[PDB]
Design a protein around this nucleic acid. Structure first.
Ligand SMILES: Cc1cn([C@H]2CC[C@@H](COP(=O)(O)OP(=O)(O)OP(=O)(O)O)O2)c(=O)[nH]c1=O
Ligand SMILES: [Mg+2]
Lengths: 944, 401, 398
DNA sequence: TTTATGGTACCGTACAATAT
DNA sequence: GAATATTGTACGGTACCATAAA
C-alpha cells in the first residue's frame, strides 16, 4: 500500500508523494551502513520501539520543473529574479552624469538634463534607481527631500510641506503625502537600491496599497553583512581598536554598517562628510529652508556613495552566494505588509493611559516615604537610621546679594489701596538675590536631586523623579534580605550587612563598614555578576517566601513587571509610520463587504526590515521582531494582536516545528550513514509528536520539570555549548523547588548522555559535522552553498570565536530554509492565481494575507511548500527520502490577527476584557493537513 | 478602633464634623443621620463635587446638567410620604372612626402624597425628550446631577439624607457593555487619582434580579468595605414604562439608524467618598497630619505673624491675603489672632487642618522681602521672596492637578 | 405681556426653563412650583451662586459656611408631616386595625414628624456654639449657606425655592450699623450685574414686635417682587433655642462679654435668576459675562473636515483647560447659514462665536464675533485664550 | 579689569528587559 | 564558554558658558 518504512522502522512518505518528488529509483543504502545504524541505535538502547503509523496523505502535487528538486527550485528562482538582476546589471554598467550645478526649488519630481536644465516630470520612468530620502524629525514622519540616481539622469523631489508654508499640516499620514515612485500599468517591474532601503521604502506612496507591490528593493547593508559582516563582540572590538586573544587580520576586511565605513572599506578614497549641524535630526523647517543647497548636496553624496558601494559589492555577493534562491528570497523578504485599523489609535492611548496610571501609583508610594524621611534631619536622627545614614543631609544657606464698627464706603476703598500699595513696594525689592534661583535650599541634599527644577516645563510637586531603579529607592523602603538591611557597593552592586563585626555570596572585605560584614545578593547569571537593582523579576519569588521584605513590597515588584516592556518600547511602538488609505484607494471587494465600517479607519504599517542584518543573514527589525505576543500581566503586550486584516481578508500562516533540532539531526544523519534516524538524536527528533504532546521539547520539559519555553532554552543552550553550572543556574531560575545539589545532579544526568567524548555520544555526529563545516577553509551552507562572512573565515580568525561559527551553520541553514519557503510559496501563489500577499516573516514564522475565499487554498499551498522545502533539504544532504513525521505542518492558522495561538483572547492590563469584547474579533482555526485535504479536495484550482 | 476614634476626634475638634460623640458613630455617619458637617467638611465636599463635575461634565462634549426636584408630586403611586396635619386633625375630630372609613383614608393618603426622592434617575429620565432635542438626536448623550437623596433608616424611626452624584447615560444597545466598561474604568481612575493608597479602591461585578449586568465600587475602610459607587445596565424598561404609547419620540439616531437607547445609571455617594478620603489622609515619627490631596484640601495657605511692628506686619499680611484671594487660593486668616502661641502648636494645628503651606511675616520681610515657607509634606522651612509666592502656589496646585 | 410671553418662549426653547406652557405661568415660577430648569438655567444659577459666595463668604475673614439638614427631626414641636411609607405598609399588613391601635398609631405619627425646613436661620443658629469656638469668641462673625427651602403653596401643591442666607452675630450697639452696611453691600451686589441697576430698589420695614428690617425688590414688568430681606431679630431666638445658662452664649467684643444680636439676610436665587433673565431681554439676551452659562461657540466653515475638526478639538480642549465654557457646535453634522447660528447663539447669551476655516490652516486667523457689537474681527488663534480670559476678568473687576 | 563656581549638554558604562 | 539582534534608564565624568566675586 501507500505505507512505507525505512530499514530502521521509521515511517516514510506516501508512495505517490515520494514518486512525484524524489522520482523512481536510486542508490540503495549499503548493508554495512544499515548494520552500523542498528548497532548505534542498540548501543543507547533505543531500538525496537513501536510507532503508531500516521495516516497516509494522497495528493497530486503540481508539475515540477526540471528533473529534480534542485533544478525545480533553481528554475523558479531564476524566473523570479531575472528582471531584477537585469535591472541591477543595467544600473551597475552605466554612465553617470555629474551633479547639476544648482538644485531646483519646486514641488514634485524634476529631471536634470545633461546641460543642467531642470524639467518638471510626474514620475520617474527608469527601471533602476538608487534612492535616499530626508525626514525632518521635528515636524513628523513625513518625508522632506529625496534625490534619485539613474543611468539617464538625476532626479529630485521636494515635499509640499517644505516649499509651501502653512500654519497647520495634517497629523494623519495619507498616500498623497508620500513620494510617487511607481509607474501605473515595454519593461515591467522596477528595482530600487539604497542603504537601509526599508527607510526609503516606507515613504513611497504606492507601497501602502493592498493590491500588490510590483517592485523589489535591494539593500547595501544586507549585502555588506553577507560579505564582510561582523558580530556584536566583533563590532565592539573593531570600534575600540579604531579609537585606540590574537589574529587581528580580520580588521582590514570588515567594517560597521555605516555608509561612510562601508564606502571606505569597499571603495575607499576621501571620507564622507557629516554636516555636524545635523539639521534633519535637530532643526526646524526654516533651517532646511535656508540650508536647502547643502542638504541636497549631502543627499546626492549619499546616493553616489550607495551607488558606488552597490556596483562594487554586487559581483562579490553573486560569487559568494551563487544560488538564485538566496537572491529571490532576499527580494521577497523586503515587501512586508502589516494591515492596521482604527483600533491601533485606541491601543496606543489605552496602553499609555494604563502605563501612566500604574506609574503614578508606584511614585506616590515612594514620594510619601521620601517626604516622611525628611523629618529625621532634626536632632541628627539620620545617623541612627540603618538605611539613611549615608546620604547627603547637608543644607545650603539662602544666598543673598478694641470695640468694632462697620467701615465706610470710602474708608474701605482706601484700606485696600494702601494694603495693595504696600505689598507692591516689597515686590520692587526684587533687584537682589542670585539671578538664577536656587533649587530648594535648606532641604537635605538627597531630597534635592529628586525634585525637578522650577523652570522645567515638566515640573511636578514633590520628589517626582523617583523610580524603582534609583539607588535611593531600596533605602527609603528599608528593604531587608533575611532580616538584614540592604547596602550598595560600587565594586559589588547591591548586597546586605550582617551585624556582629551567615553563609552566602561573600563576605567581601573591600567594603569598610564598621561593625558589619558585607555580603552580595545572588544573581541569575552567577556569582561573577553584580545585582544592579533588587527590583527585578528574579527576586519576585524571593518576596513570596519572606526572604525579601519591605517596610507594598510585592506590589512594587509586581507593578514593575507590568510596565517593564512598555517602558523600553513605547517610544518606537508609538512612533510607527501609519498611512491611512482613503475610500477610493481601498479595493472594491472590501467596500461591498458587510463587515466594512464607513466611519472606521483602515491603514497599513510597512516594517523597516534589513533582510540580512546578521552574520547568519537574519532579518532585523527594531520593533516587530522583538515584540511580545500577549501576556496576562504585561501592559501593551498585545502589540501583535492589533495587526488586523481588512474585511474580506484573513491571515494564513504557520510556524516551523523544531527547525534547529531537525536541521542538526538531519546533518548528523547525513554525515553518519546517509539514512534518516541513524543518529540517536535524529531518531529521537523524528519520533517527536506535537499533537500527541511527546516531542523533544515536551519530553525535556517533562523530565526537567519546567515549561516548554524553558525546555527550548535549555536544549538550544546545550546544543550551542553551555556548561553544567549554566544548566544548573537555568534550572534553579526556572524551577524554585530544586536545590543546588539536586539541580546539579539533574544537569549532570542530562549532559552525561549527550555529546560524549566526537564519538560515543548521543549527538556526536552533528557536532562533528558542524565542526568540519565551520573549520573548512571556506565554510558554506550545506543546502544553498552560501559562504560565511570574510571576517569569520579560519584564515582571518584562526581558533577564535568558535561558538559563533558553529552556530552560524545552523542559523544560516534556517535562513536558507526560510528563503526556500518564500520562493516556493510565491511560485505556488503565482501559478494557481491565488489572491494573496506576503504579510511578514519572523525567522521561522511565515504569515500571508489572503482573501476570505482562498484561505483553504493558501493553507494547502503552505503545506505543499513546507513539504517541498523539507524534501529539498533531504536531497541536498544526500538522502533520497523524507520521514512522514516531519513532512507537514502541525497546524496552519487562519485568523484575523497576529497571535501565537488562535484561541487566546489576549487579556492584558491594558485590555482586560479581551479582543472579542473590545473589537469583535472571534477566535481562529488551526487546521491540519488532513482537514485541508478534506476541505479543498486536495487541489489548488479555483473550479475544484 | 483606636485610629478611627482618633480620626473622629480630630475631625470634630478641627470643625470637619459636628455634634457630640454620641451621634458621631460609624453607623450614623454611614446612614446619613449625622447632625451635619463643619465648615472644613463643607469645603472638602465642595472641592470633591467640583472635581467630579470637571472630570464628568466639563470635559465631555455630550454631557449636560439636569435639575430634578427633591419632591415628586404624586397623582396616584404604586405601593417618606408628606401628609398634612390638618387632614389628620379633621379626621380625629370625628370620633366614630369606622373600619371602612379609616381604610379608605389610609388608601387616599397612600395614593396622594409627595414622595421624597431616593435617587436622581427618575428626574433625569423625566428630561429625556428635551435633552435629546438639545443634542439634536445624536446618541450617545448623558445627563449629570449632584444633589441630596433621602433614604429611610431603620433601628422609633429616623431620616437619612445623602449627597449623591448621578450620571444617566443613553447609549445604543450594541455598545451598552462597552460604554459600561469605559465608565467603570473612568470612575475607578477618578476615585484612585486623589487617594494616597489607590489599592484600597476596588471594583466588582454583579447582576440584578432580572440578570442585568452591573458593577460596584468599594472603599476599604478599617472595619471593612462600604460601597461608594454603583453602575447598572438597566436597558430600556424604565424608559418605556415612563413613556407609554408611541415610541417614535423615544427613537435615538446613531449613525444612520433609529433605535430606543439603553439606560446606563452611575450613582456615587459624595459624603461617603469624603469620609473615605479623610480616612485615606490619616495613616518613630509620630505626627498627626491629614495629608489631603492639594485639589481637595479645604484651606491651603495659613498666614501668621512674628515679632516687630504690628501695624506694618498686619498691612503686609492683609495685602498678601487680598492678592491670594484674588488669585483664587484659600487662606486661613491666622494673623488676626490676638493671642500668641508657639510655632509648634500652630504647625500642629495647621497639620491637623490639612494646611498645605504656612507663611509667617516678620520684620525681615519689611527689610528685604523674605518670608518663611513651610511645607506640610516635608516639614522643612524655606525662605522665599514674597513677590513670587502667588505664582509658586498656583503652579503647585496646577501641577498637582 | 407680549414681552413676557416672548421671553418665556425663548427661555423654554433655548433650554433655560422646562415643561410646557401650561406650567410656565408667572405664578408657578414665582411660587416655586415650576417643573424645573434647563441646563442653561442650571449653569446660570451656578454662576450666580458662585458670585454670591465669592462676594459674601470668600472675601470676608469672619464668615464661614454652615451645613443645615433639609429635615428637622424633633418631637413635641409646638403648634406638612413626613411619614414613612414603610411604616404605613407594615400597619396595613395587619388587617385587624382596631380602634385603639389606629388611634395610637395616629398619635405616634403626629408631635414623630420631621418638618421640612422653611428657612436656613434655624440650622445656622443651631451651630452657634461650635462656630463661635471656631472664631475663638471674636465678635462679629457670620454663617452663610446656600440651599433649598420648602414653602407651602395655596390655590394643594408644594413649592421649593433656592435661598442664600447669611446669619450675622453682632454686638448690640453696632447692630444697626452692620445692618446698614449689609444692606448697602447686598444692594451693590445686586446692581453690579444688572444692565439697568435702577430696577433694583430697597425699602424700610418693621416687624410685629417693632424690630427694624429692610427689603430688596426687583421691578418686574408686572410689578415689584421681593428678592432679599434683612432683619434685626435681636437675641430672642438665640435665647429661646438655648434656655438656661447664658455663659456659653457670651461673645467677646473688645474687652467685654455680651450676648450677640442676630442679623438675618435671606435672598432668593431663583427669583434673582429670573430677574436677571428679564434684565437681559434683535432677540439677544445680554447676560453679564460673569453669569452667562456658555461663553464661546465653536463652528466650522468649508474645507478639509478632518483638519478643521482636529483644530477645533484642540482649541476646545485648551479653552476647557483654561476654565472657559464652550458650546461644541462643530460636531453638528447638519449645516446651517451663519445668520441662523448667530441668532441661535444670541438667544443663548453667547459672548463670542468662533469659526475655523481653511484660512486658519493656512495662516492661523479665526473669525471672532462679539455678541454686544455684532462685528466680525479676524484674530490669531494663539492669543484667543488670553483675550477671552482677560475679557472675563476685566468684566468682573469693573 | 582678572579669577572661582554652579548649571547644563554630551557621552561612556553597567544592568536589565524584549524576540527568535 | 549558549548564540544572534534590539533598546531603555541610572550614574558618573568632562567641558563650555554665564554668573558673581576680588
Ligand atoms: C528560544 C530560543 C530560540 N533559539 C533559536 C533556535 C531555533 C529558532 C526558532 O526555534 P523556536 O525559537 O521558534 O522554537 P522551536 O524549537 O521551533 O519550537 P516550535 O517547534 O516552534 O514549537 O530560535 C535560540 O537559539 N535560543 C533560544 O533560547
Ligand atoms: Mg518553531
Amino acid at each position: 500500500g501507500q505505507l512505507r518504512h525505512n530499514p530502521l522502522d521509521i515511517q516514510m512518505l506516501s508512495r505517490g508523494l515520494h514518486e512525484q518528488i524524489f522520482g523512481q529509483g536510486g542508490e540503495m543504502p549499503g548493508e554495512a551502513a544499515v548494520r552500523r545504524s542498528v548497532e548505534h541505535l542498540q548501543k543507547h538502547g533505543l531500538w525496537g520501539q513501536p510507532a503508531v503509523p500516521l495516516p497516509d496523505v494522497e495528493l497530486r502535487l503540481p508539475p515540477l520543473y526540471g528533473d529534480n528538486l534542485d533544478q525545480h527550485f533553481r528554475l523558479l528562482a531564476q524566473k523570479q529574479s531575472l528582471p531584477y538582476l537585469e535591472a541591477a546589471n543595467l544600473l551597475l554598467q552605466a554612465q553617470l552624469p555629474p551633479k547639476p550645478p544648482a538644485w531646483a526649488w519646486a514641488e514634485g519630481w524634476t529631471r536634470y538634463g545633461p546641460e543642467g536644465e531642470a524639467v518638471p516630470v510626474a514620475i520617474p520612468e527608469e527601471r533602476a534607481l538608487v534612492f535616499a530620502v530626508a525626514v525632518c524629525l521635528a515636524e513628523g514622519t513625513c518625508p522632506t527631500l529625496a534625490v534619485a540616481i539613474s543611468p539617464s539622469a538625476w532626479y529630485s523631489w521636494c515635499s509640499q510641506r517644505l516649499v509651501e508654508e502653512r500654519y497647520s499640516w495634517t497629523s494623519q499620514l495619507s498616500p498623497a503625502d508620500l513620494i510617487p515612485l511607481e509607474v501605473p500599468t515595454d519593461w515591467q517591474e522596477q528595482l530600487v537600491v539604497g542603504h537601509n532601503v526599508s527607510f526609503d521604502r516606507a515613504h513611497i506612496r504606492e507601497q501602502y496599497l493592498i493590491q500588490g507591490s510590483r517592485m523589489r528593493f535591494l539593500d547595501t547593508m544586507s549585502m555588506h553583512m553577507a560579505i564582510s559582516g561582523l558580530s556584536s563582540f566583533q563590532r565592539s572590538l573593531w570600534i575600540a581598536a579604531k579609537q585606540g586573544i590574537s589574529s587581528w587580520d580580520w580588521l582590514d576586511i570588515s567594517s560597521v554598517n555605516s555608509l561612510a565605513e562601508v564606502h571606505r572599506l569597499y571603495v575607499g578614497g576621501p571620507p564622507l562628510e557629516k554636516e555636524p549641524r545635523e539639521l534633519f535630526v535637530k532643526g526646524t523647517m526654516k533651517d532646511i529652508r535656508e540650508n536647502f543647497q547643502d542638504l541636497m548636496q549631502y543627499c546626492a553624496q549619499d546616493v553616489w556613495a550607495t551607488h558606488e558601494v552597490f556596483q562594487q559589492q554586487l559581483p562579490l555577493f553573486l560569487e559568494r552566494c551563487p544560488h538564485p534562491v538566496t537572491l529571490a528570497g532576499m527580494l521577497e523578504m523586503g515587501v512586508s505588509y502589516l494591515p492596521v485599523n482604527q483600533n491601533w489609535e485606541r491601543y496606543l492611548a489605552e496602553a499609555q493611559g494604563t502605563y501612566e496610571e500604574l506609574q503614578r501609583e508606584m511614585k506616590k508610594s515612594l514620594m510619601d516615604l521620601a517626604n516622611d524621611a525628611c523629618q529625621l534631619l532634626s536632632g541628627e536622627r539620620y545617623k541612627e537610621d540603618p538605611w539613611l545614614w549615608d546620604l547627603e543631609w547637608d543644607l545650603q544657606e539662602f544666598k543673598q546679594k478694641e470695640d468694632l464698627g462697620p467701615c465706610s464706603e470710602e474708608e474701605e476703598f482706601q484700606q485696600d489701596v494702601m494694603a495693595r500699595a504696600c505689598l507692591q513696594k516689597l515686590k520692587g525689592t526684587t533687584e537682589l538675590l542670585p539671578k538664577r534661583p536656587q533649587h530648594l535650599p535648606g532641604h537635605p541634599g538627597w531630597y534635592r536631586k529628586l525634585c525637578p527644577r522650577l523652570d522645567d516645563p515638566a515640573w511636578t510637586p514633590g520628589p517626582s523623579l523617583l523610580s524603582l531603579q534609583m539607588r535611593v529607592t531600596p533605602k527609603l523602603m528599608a528593604l531587608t534580605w533575611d532580616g538584614f538591611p540592604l547596602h550598595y557597593s560600587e565594586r559589588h552592586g547591591w548586597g546586605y550587612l550582617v551585624p556582629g563585626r551567615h553563609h552566602g555570596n561573600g563576605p567581601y572585605n573591600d567594603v569598610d563598614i564598621p561593625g558589619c560584614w558585607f555580603f552580595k545578593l545572588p544573581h541569575k547569571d552567577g556569582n561573577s555578576c553584580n545585582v544592579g537593582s533588587p527590583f527585578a523579576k528574579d527576586f519576585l519569588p524571593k518576596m513570596e517566601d519572606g526572604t525579601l521584605q519591605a517596610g507594598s513590597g510585592p506590589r512594587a515588584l509586581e507593578i514593575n513587571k507590568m510596565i517593564s516592556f512598555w517602558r523600553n518600547a513605547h517610544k518606537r511602538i508609538s512612533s510607527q509610520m501609519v498611512v491611512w488609505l482613503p475610500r477610493s484607494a481601498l479595493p472594491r471587494a472590501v467596500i461591498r463587504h458587510p463587515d466594512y465600517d464607513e466611519e472606521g479607519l483602515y491603514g497599513a504599517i510597512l516594517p523597516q526590515v534589513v533582510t540580512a542584518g546578521t552574520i547568519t543573514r537574519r532579518a532585523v527589525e527594531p520593533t516587530w521582531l522583538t515584540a511580545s505576543n500577549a501576556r496576562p500581566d504585561r501592559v501593551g503586550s498585545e502589540l501583535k494582536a492589533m495587526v488586523q486584516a481588512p474585511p474580506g481578508y484573513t491571515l494564513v500562516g504557520a510556524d516551523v516545528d523544531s527547525q534547529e533540532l531537525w536541521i542538526a539531526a538531519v546533518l548528523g544523519d547525513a554525515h553518519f550513514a546517509g539514512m534518516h534516524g541513524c543518529t540517536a538524536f535524529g531518531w529521537m527528533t523524528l519520533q517527536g509528536r506535537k499533537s500527541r504532546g511527546t516531542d523533544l521539547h515536551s519530553k525535556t520539559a517533562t523530565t526537567v520539570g519546567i515549561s516548554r519555553e524553558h525546555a527550548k532554552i535549555f536544549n538550544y543552550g546545550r546544543i550551542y555549548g553551555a556548561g553544567q553550572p549554566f544548566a544548573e543556574r537555568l534550572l534553579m531560575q526556572f524551577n524554585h523547588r530544586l536545590t543546588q545539589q539536586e539541580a546539579a545532579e539533574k544537569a549532570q544526568q542530562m549532559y552525561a548522555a549527550t555529546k560524549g567524548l566526537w564519538k560515543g555520544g548521543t549527538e556526536s555526529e552533528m557536532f562533528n559535522k558542524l565542526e568540519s563545516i565551520a573549520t573548512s577553509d571556506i565554510p558554506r551552507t550545506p543546502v544553498l552553498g552560501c559562504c560565511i562572512s570574510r571576517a569569520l573565515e579560519p584564515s582571518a580568525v584562526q581558533e577564535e570565536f568558535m561558538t559563533s561559527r558553529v552556530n552560524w551553520v545552523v542559523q544560516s541553514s534556517a535562513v536558507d530554509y526560510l528563503h526556500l519557503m518564500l520562493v516556493a510559496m510565491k511560485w505556488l501563489f503565482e501559478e494557481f492565481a491565488i489572491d494573496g500577499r506576503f504579510c511578514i516573516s519572523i525567522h521561522d514564522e511565515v504569515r500571508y494575507l489572503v482573501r476570505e475565499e482562498d484561505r483553504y487554498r493558501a493553507a494547502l499551498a503552505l503545506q505543499i511548500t513546507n513539504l517541498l522545502t523539507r524534501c529539498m533539504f533531504a536531497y541536498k544532504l544526500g538522502l533520497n527520502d523524507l520521514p512522514q513525521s516531519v513532512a507537514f505542518f502541525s497546524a496552519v492558522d487562519i485568523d484575523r490577527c497576529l497571535r501565537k495561538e488562535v484561541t487566546m483572547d489576549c487579556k492584558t492590563p491594558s485590555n482586560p476584557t479581551g479582543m472579542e469584547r473590545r473589537y469583535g474579533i472571534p477566535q481562529g482555526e488551526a487546521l491540519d493537513i488532513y482537514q485541508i485535504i478534506e476541505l479543498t479536495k486536495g487541489s489548488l484550482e479555483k473550479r475544484s | 478602633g483606636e485610629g478611627s476614634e482618633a480620626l473622629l476626634e480630630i475631625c470634630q475638634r478641627r470643625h470637619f464634623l459636628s455634634g457630640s460623640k454620641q451621634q458621631l458613630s460609624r453607623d450614623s455617619l454611614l446612614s446619613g443621620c449625622h447632625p451635619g458637617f463643619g465648615p472644613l467638611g463643607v469645603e472638602l465636599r465642595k472641592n470633591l463635587a467640583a472635581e467630579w463635575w470637571t472630570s464628568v461634565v466639563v470635559f465631555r462634549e455630550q454631557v449636560f446638567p439636569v435639575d430634578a426636584l427633591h419632591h415628586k408630586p404624586g397623582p396616584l403611586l404604586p405601593g417618606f410620604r408628606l401628609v398634612s396635619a390638618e387632614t389628620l386633625r379633621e379626621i380625629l375630630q370625628d370620633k366614630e372612626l369606622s373600619k371602612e372609613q379609616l381604610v379608605a383614608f389610609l388608601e387616599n393618603v397612600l395614593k396622594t402624597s409627595g414622595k421624597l426622592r431616593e435617587n436622581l434617575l427618575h428626574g433625569a429620565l423625566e428630561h429625556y425628550v428635551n435633552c435629546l432635542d438639545l443634542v439634536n438626536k445624536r446618541l450617545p448623550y448623558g445627563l449629570a446631577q449632584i444633589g441630596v437623596c433621602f433614604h429611610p433608616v431603620f433601628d422609633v424611626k429616623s431620616i437619612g439624607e445623602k449627597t449623591e452624584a448621578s450620571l444617566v447615560w443613553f447609549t445604543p444597545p450594541r455598545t451598552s457593555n462597552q460604554w459600561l466598561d469605559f465608565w467603570l474604568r473612568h470612575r475607578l481612575q477618578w476615585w484612585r487619582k486623589f487617594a494616597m493608597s489607590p489599592s484600597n479602591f476596588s471594583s466588582s461585578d454583579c447582576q440584578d434580579e432580572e440578570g442585568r449586568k452591573g458593577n460596584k465600587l468599594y472603599y476599604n475602610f478599617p472595619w471593612g468595605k462600604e460601597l461608594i459607587e454603583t453602575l447598572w445596565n438597566l436597558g430600556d424598561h424604565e424608559l418605556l414604562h415612563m413613556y407609554p404609547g408611541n415610541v417614535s419620540k423615544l427613537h435615538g439616531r446613531d449613525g444612520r439608524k433609529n433605535v430606543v437607547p439603553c439606560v446606563l445609571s452611575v450613582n456615587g455617594d459624595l459624603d461617603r467618598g469624603m469620609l473615605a478620603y479623610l480616612y485615606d489622609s490619616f495613616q518613630n515619627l509620630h505626627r498627626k497630619v491629614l495629608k489631603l490631596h492639594p485639589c481637595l484640601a479645604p484651606i491651603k495657605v495659613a498666614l501668621d505673624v512674628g515679632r516687630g511692628p504690628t501695624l506694618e506686619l498686619r498691612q503686609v499680611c492683609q495685602g498678601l491675603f487680598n492678592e491670594l484671594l484674588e488669585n483664587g487660593i484659600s487662606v486661613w486668616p491666622g494673623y488676626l489672632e490676638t493671642m500668641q502661641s508657639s510655632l509648634e502648636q500652630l504647625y500642629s494645628k495647621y497639620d491637623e487642618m490639612s494646611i498645605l503651606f504656612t507663611v509667617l511675616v516678620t520684620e525681615t520681610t519689611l527689610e528685604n522681602g523674605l518670608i518663611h515657607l513651610r511645607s506640610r509634606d516635608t516639614t522643612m522651612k524655606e525662605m522665599m521672596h514674597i513677590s513670587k509666592l502667588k505664582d509658586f502656589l498656583i503652579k503647585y496646585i496646577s501641577s498637582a492637578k
